[PDB]
């Protein structure tokens, strides 16, 4: 019942002109997908990108999540979450840890991959488009407790934990190539993405239509705004509140017939919404960075 957490990827480059990376490890004499264990304090996406780079030499942008693999190891259970990862370049160099890397079309990769569960992940990869754009919907970080007053507490700030969540989110949102920033009209939403804003040197666009009060008064306007943001070029981060996110995510998944594999709505959590030709093809719920 102890889980060793890991992550990795189907690393790909230019549906069926695509080539994917398969690695060989001398220690096990295996052919598999690049992946590795999370370091203390890392989230799965951050670890996937790091391990891809360490094992293949490539940087990449993570897209759609492609499922979970588990198997027994002496310490308990190895758990690996996999992403589609588009190469943004690099060069492999053989070493003692990974001695070969082959770029293969999917059919040939299917034969090269020795583990059934890697083949399962690769089947998931080909099931939907992988050249995706990404919308990142983030519930703001922890911000103490609502006051006894009516409504919201417009200026209530992140607490110490929440400020740490905000800092931890930078690496997680960068893993997906976030480029533009949007926050509902509450201090705690802006503060969650301020560290990212500082990192990108971008301003945060204020969104009065996406607050809890606004969604409860005019949900259609909130939905319309979400779609307007998502249609703009780049990969937007939109930080908003707990009474808003589940309704927006459910409505989009329903209209697009997308089934999320995981669900939740925790403060500091992220939904990764993958779009292909402006249609939703994936909705992946990530835990807060300091939670499992
Ligand atoms: N890469 C990989 N290895 C697996 C899978 N299933 C499975 O039994 N193995 C075996 O699990 C054992 C431990 O390998 P591992 O790759 O999980 O562990 P690791 O800590 O050395 O590497 P990591 O840092 O990449 O997680 C190896 O004997 C390997 O053959 C799988 O789906 N993928
Ligand atoms: N190197 C290696 N390859 C294995 C194994 N099992 C296993 O099924 N294979 C498959 O055998 C083929 C590669 O053989 P080599 O060229 O000898 O590395 C690939 O289809 C692998 O998926 C194994 O333990 N080692
Ligand atoms: Mg590894």
Curated annotation (Swiss-Prot):
The keyword tRNA-binding does not apply. Coiled coil: none annotated. A motif (Nudix box) lies at residues 36-57. Keywords: DNA damage, DNA repair, DNA replication, Hydrolase, Magnesium, Metal-binding. Its EC number is 3.6.1.69, 3.6.1.58, 3.6.1.61. Disruption phenotype: 12-fold spontaneous mutation frequency increase by rifampicin resistance screening. Can also use Mn(2+), with lower efficiency. Residues 2-126 form the Nudix hydrolase domain. It comes from the Bacteria. Gene3D superfamilies: Nucleoside Triphosphate Pyrophosphohydrolase (3.90.79.10), Phosphoglycerate mutase-like (3.40.50.1240). The keyword Magnesium applies. It catalyses: 8-oxo-dGTP + H2O = 8-oxo-dGDP + phosphate + H(+); 8-oxo-GTP + H2O = 8-oxo-GDP + phosphate + H(+); 8-oxo-dGDP + H2O = 8-oxo-dGMP + phosphate + H(+); 8-oxo-GDP + H2O = 8-oxo-GMP + phosphate + H(+). One of its GO terms (biological process) is DNA repair. Ap4A hydrolysis is inhibited by fluoride ions. Substrate binds at residues 25-28, 30, 35-37, 71, 78, 97, 115. Disulfide bonds: none annotated. Contains an N-terminal Nudix hydrolase domain, followed by a linker region and a C-terminal histidine phosphatase domain. The C-terminal domain is necessary for efficient catalysis by the Nudix hydrolase domain. Belongs to the Nudix hydrolase family. This is 8-oxo-(d)GTP phosphatase. It comes from Mycolicibacterium smegmatis (strain ATCC 700084 / mc(2)155) (Mycobacterium smegmatis).
